[PDB]
Design an enzyme around this catalytic site. Structure first.
Site, PDB file in Angstrom:
ATOM      1  N   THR A  84       0.617  -1.344   0.002  1.00  0.00           N
ATOM      2  CA  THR A  84      -0.043  -0.023   0.129  1.00  0.00           C
ATOM      3  C   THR A  84       0.900   1.174   0.078  1.00  0.00           C
ATOM      4  OG1 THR A  84      -2.012  -0.885   0.943  1.00  0.00           O
ATOM      5  CG2 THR A  84      -1.314   1.323   1.418  1.00  0.00           C
ATOM      6  N   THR A  85       0.435   2.442  -0.696  1.00  0.00           N
ATOM      7  CA  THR A  85       0.928   3.694  -0.233  1.00  0.00           C
ATOM      8  C   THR A  85      -0.087   4.612  -0.440  1.00  0.00           C
ATOM      9  OG1 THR A  85       2.574   3.092  -1.949  1.00  0.00           O
ATOM     10  CG2 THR A  85       2.153   5.255  -1.652  1.00  0.00           C
TER      11      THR A  85
END
Lengths: 203, 227, 227, 227, 227, 227, 203, 203, 227
Positions: free
Chosen positions: G1-2
């Protein structure tokens, strides 16, 4: 740490050093390990500092309340039996400590208490990592017939020896003398230093 | 009607059952406290029911710790229970903070326990008043506390049967910062003013504390020199 | 009949036992609060029961935190207990959110505790009214709160025996955004209008707070300049 | 006799103590709601006790969430406590399911809480009635709810002292699917019919919501255009 | 005397307080149920309090699940609470065993809840009667249940104000195994017999279920064909 | 009026229900205790209900431990229950501290249990008085204790029907530090003074303890030498 | 995830990508990791999806209730202090998450919060497995003086870089811009794509 | 982290740096580790940030409440004894922290408190991963007779040294000076920077 | 006076409230049990309230397990609740030990539950009597049990309105070890003796069990052969 308690004719002498270490790291050079907890009772602490300090506070509170309620001081053996019960009750989540309780009721006493509530009375005892070195000095030099001055010197020596060979021990030596006549008297620093100098020692 | 349960207000907004508890206090022996120069003292009278009683026992002046004391008046069993709550409450505070900075807080805790029993049905109030006197970090303190849980700080005050006698005498006679000896004499004098002449004051209790010291309980001989 | 238990409605839908609690509030000393330009203030009278009492003690104006204060009237032990609930409630809010955005919510929490004791049998109501005054993120606030748990926000109001005197005087004389000094003078003047002439106003308590500051308690000398 | 405890039936099978709670509701300010074309509105009168009161405070119309609002009449402290139950209850439902599909269920939860206090001894009923108005997945909704826990859905209704006036007026005058502006006019007109002529209607509260929108609270100027 | 607590027997061994609850049931709208050929039906009248009420709301016939329905009479808030207990009780049984083999047991559970409130002090009874009608593995079932927790199984029965009218009419007119249409006609006719002529029967509710199917609620048009 | 519940004060601040418990104590057999040279003793009379009773059973003098003993008067079942509380309380202390330094504390614990039953509704007081006598680290002790929880320390005292007789006799006759034999003789003589002449004293119970010893129960023959 | 959150003069910009993986297995390409939780507050989630989603629902509920009770929006710092307490209370059975809370009260703020309740304010922050790559773009390219358009481009880039080098990150970029004027506005997809094309990027 | 507390004649000086790291990853360059918790009391935190922050909030709340109730400030020793009890009570599910509490009552004091409730008073102390480096500077350079200006410089140096050799320490140095006269005063950033420049240092 | 709470003794040592519960039992339908050669049987009358009731439902004879059955009389809801307690109690015993060795113990458990409700305030007694009949390892058993928790074992007995009629008839006519058919005839005859002539016995319930078998419920046709 090094703490010691000895008995004599009509007196109890208790002494400690002051060093506090987080492992090899000397965090504090003047911690306190000797406390008066009643008119004629003193306690020395070794082990986890937080557990020791909590117990110092409880014993002060409880011995004061007891005295007010009974109009007499808790017998020293009673102080030990109380501590014995307290500590055993929580043996599986214990106070990680070794205590000395010393005082005068009808006679002098010193009791040594472990983190399971084991309590035993003895003519002398020591606790902490320096204690073996103390037990050495005492085995060789303690006498029942010693005078209070002789006894004070003895404990100064035992702890000086401990300090020289236990890196967990160090700092100024504290001494208290407990007698019927004058109660618990904490000897003044300048007097201890004088005796250290006169006996030819260090730190 | 509005007279018979702690939980019931009268139409004028009164709690008679609490007012009645307060009458119980008037049936006790008279005791007084007063502040003087760098200190506070307590003096208490005592019913001596017989000569078969033991004098050096069940004291009207009770130490809460070395620097705080109390006298009480009213139902004696209630009073005993409250003094021991006070003592345990004091020690709890010392264990928490290492000392008792302000006595007013001890008193409030005791006063709150008392107030609680003037609000929940199923209990009656304690029929007791207390005076607390001691030294703390503010200075010498003197408080009283009644069955309602009401608290006041005084220079001098009293509780018991002879309360009104003793409070008048002090309203006329009390000055601040007397030396200890004169404060004690004024107190004995005030106490006598509440007796009914003919009737004479036997050995009463006297305790005193001054700044930087612990309490000090006068023995019966020392007390005698003032009679 | 319908008069004797907190849980009983009268046939007209009234809770007399609560109305009776409200009469206990009329027996207290008079106090008042009012908003002025960028601030709010409190002024309280005080029964001085004797000269043997200690003045610098048991204050009618009590700080709840640095930016909020309360005055109370009615049963004193009940009041004390409610002020400490108020203080602990305030600190819970600060710990949860980091600050007290709206004082109305502290007041509501105190008012809800009070309401609760007008619904469950086994307890009586608190015979107390309070005024809360402080600064929050809305601005300067002034609330009152009674035994029923009823709340109102005011520009000026009062509680105690002289309430009605003080509220009339202010209905005629109050203006918004006065400077502090004039606001305090209007207040002292209003307070005097509730006394019974002959009877004269001794040293009362005065606290005030303005936007961007903490509370400020007037000492007896500063107060004297207005007498 | 059969009059004095919430747990006692009369011989005709009545709970008078609940009927009495219903009289407390008649002492409140009159408020009304009504459905109109794709929406629902609330209007409330207000006792303005003085000019020292703060107007922008303690509102009779209270938002429960963005799409549901309530007006209440009766004991104010009870009403406050109920509105906050209503809010917490709404949020519990949104957390469980992600939304509030049918407002009837919120109302039932509130109504059940009220019913519970008409069955167990040791508590009195809430002396409150409420109107809830909002939009949900069924459409625009308007409910009322009384101290008994009884619920009804309406096209228009009212609560408070002027209830009967307002309900007659609406029985004669109400039509469904009015435009918002005419619906508000009819409401104001109806409200006026409950006053006692001479007596004139000051600034009342008005909130409205239409399908696909959030609630909208009319400010006092917007309200004025209808007076 | 023996009249005023659910826990008190009369000297003849009666529980008047329960008998009184039973009077609450007489104040409800009349409803009836009857068994016919491979099925069971319910019909309910309805107070229509005004034309401002919403018709398609708060229904007298309530589904407990797809195969079981109930009609109730008496205190409405109590009825609501019991119908929801009934529903939750139905689903617990289905989760435990996968299905509801015998409706009698659901009814007994509801009936036991009711009985419980006729034995322990501190609660009043539910002032409600219910009829439950559905299909289970025994066949079509029809039960009633009252405030005492008493249960009976019927071929036809009724509850509400017009109960006695409707039961007599049915004692004379009911036959078993009618086709659905005639059963419904007999029901409407019976229901009318309980009205006070002049007074005419508006749109009532009608639900029916036959073996192998789910319940089926008649809409107001279908219902109209029988008026 | 003020007579009928342990939680009610009279307007004079009395708890009559406790005063009444105290009358139960007058109905018991007379017992007495007294201090003498290095010791303390108890002597008890005994109703001998018949010659079919067993003598060497249910003793009026009961050991609490080897160094403490109690006599009781009043309701016997209450007295039994209190003596066993006293024993268990004594052992708890010994386990905690290893010994029982001051008997006053045991007594207080018992007195507190009794006081507690004079404050919470739902219980009646114990209709019992006790005398405790023993040796502790202070010396020989002699206490009494009543239903109210009141405690006193004596040189000599008594409880039971003949109390007043025995206390007068001792007020005239008692001296301190008698040898054991003379002390016992004084006691028997005192006990006789409470009988109604004609009536003669059968075999009573006698226990004694002296410093550095355990208790010692006199057998009937040894007792006889004093009759 | 970012996920990322930045502050500017009078604005907060928050962005995330949408990929959800059970290990190396891309289960869902359009999960949602950016949520509005108040008029002027947004939250991004990284970590265990169940713990994240529960917290999103609580924050929505509790911030709505707070606003009705106080008649003002929870201060952004308060939102953080609440989360801080919630998470720390259950530290030994924690929500396995990293949160960003961003919003406008009297000024813009971005707070970063860990699974033990550590909360810290910063001018910018990022979270998830792609965060180091983002912190690289931002260290090099972030300016305080950036405009809201410049800022939106910046975050698009930071995430596009993260996506190129984190296999746990991917899918469409979501952006929200929070201003006093227009509140929390979630930029439309076709606008984000247009800027991706104009900046010369991919996915 | 590096925090330090020293005592002088009538003053206490406390200082910290601001870096917050998730392992080797510098997540935030300006966290806050020095807080005022009463009129004449300050606290520094090291250890798990969540546990630290919760305790800061409690100490603020409880010391404010205490003051209103007692109409005096909590004695510094009292603040330590409170913390000591709080932390020991939960020793087996502890606050993973090291605290410094410093202040003025009738005299200056600095106390150092560990995650088991061990509390010890000292003329100076330091905590965090940079503390050994600080203890070096102080051992060599601290004097009791130092002035407040000399003391402020000393702590700026100790921390600068810590920052140079502890990769877990970094960012702007915060200093507060606590005196009876002016209370707790947090020195302004530009004044600290000036002294950094004048002493010839970096970061 | 002594009449109105289950916890109150009359001065003659009676519990009238329990005696009143016993009057509830007289209002039930008459049922009887009797032992015959290697077995036991039950027979019960039944109110048939209408022809709209369902016969094959709510049975007066209820199986507790395959070898034990009960008939009850009194308040029906209380009886239902007690039969289910009985069934659950039976299964607990079977799970603990694998079987039900002695039916007297099942009965005692049921009887103890009943006794318990004659001793603690806040509950009324169950207004029920039961007869239990079955086979166990002792042999065929027949017990009754009333609201007081009193138990007896019989050769024959009865409960309900016609109890006294049926017990006289049996006191004159019963013999032990009849064959089943004659036992049943004696029973029907006895039952008829309690009716009021004119009044005629419709279809009653009949169950029987013999050693080494399970219970056996007579169907209405088999029953008819004895009418």
């Amino acid at each position: 740490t090094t703490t010691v308690g000895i008995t004599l004719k009509d007196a109890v002498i208790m002494a400690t050093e002051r060093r506090v270490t987080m492992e090899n790291f000397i965090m504090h050079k003047n911690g306190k390990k000797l406390f008066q907890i009643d008119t004629y009772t003193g306690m020395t602490i070794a082990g986890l500092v937080g557990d020791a300090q909590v117990l110092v506070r409880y014993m002060k509170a409880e011995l004061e309340l007891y005295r007010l309620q009974r109009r007499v001081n808790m017998p020293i053996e009673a102080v030990a039996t109380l501590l014995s019960n307290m500590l055993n009750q929580v043996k599986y989540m214990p106070y990680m400590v070794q205590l000395l309780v010393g005082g005068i009721d009808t006679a002098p006493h010193v009791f040594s208490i472990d983190a399971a509530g084991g309590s035993v009375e003895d003519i002398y005892a020591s606790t902490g990592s320096g204690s073996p070195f103390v037990y050495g000095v005492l085995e060789s030099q303690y006498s029942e017939k010693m005078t209070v001055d002789e006894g004070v010197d003895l404990v100064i020596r035992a702890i000086s020896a401990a300090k020289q060979r236990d890196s967990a021990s160090g700092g100024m030596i504290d001494v208290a003398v407990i007698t019927r006549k004058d109660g618990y008297v904490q000897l003044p620093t300048d007097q201890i230093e004088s005796r250290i100098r006169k006996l030819g020692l260090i730190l | 009607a509005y007279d018979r349960a702690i939980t019931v207000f009268s139409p004028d907004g009164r709690l008679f059952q609490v007012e009645y508890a307060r009458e119980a206090v008037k049936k006790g022996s008279t005791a007084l406290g007063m502040k003087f120069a760098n200190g506070v003292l307590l003096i208490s009278d005592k019913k001596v029911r017989s000569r078969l009683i033991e004098q050096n026992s069940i004291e009207k002046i009770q130490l809460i710790d070395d620097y705080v004391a109390a006298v009480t008046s009213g139902l004696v069993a209630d009073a005993r229970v409250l003094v021991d709550f006070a003592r345990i409450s004091a020690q709890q505070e010392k264990v928490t903070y290492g000392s008792l900075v302000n006595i007013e807080n001890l008193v409030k805790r005791v006063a709150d326990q008392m107030q609680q029993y003037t609000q929940y049905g199923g209990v009656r109030p304690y029929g007791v008043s207390l005076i607390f006197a001691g030294i703390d970090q503010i200075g010498p303190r003197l408080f009283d506390c009644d069955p309602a849980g009401t608290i006041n700080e005084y220079k001098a005050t009293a509780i018991g049967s002879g309360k009104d006698a003793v409070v008048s005498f002090l309203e006329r006679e009390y000055k601040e910062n007397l030396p200890e000896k004169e404060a004690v004499t004024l107190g004995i004098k005030a106490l006598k003013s509440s007796l009914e002449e003919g009737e004479e004051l036997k050995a009463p209790e006297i305790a005193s504390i001054t700044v930087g010291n612990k309490y000090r309980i006068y023995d019966q001989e020392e007390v005698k020199k003032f009679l």
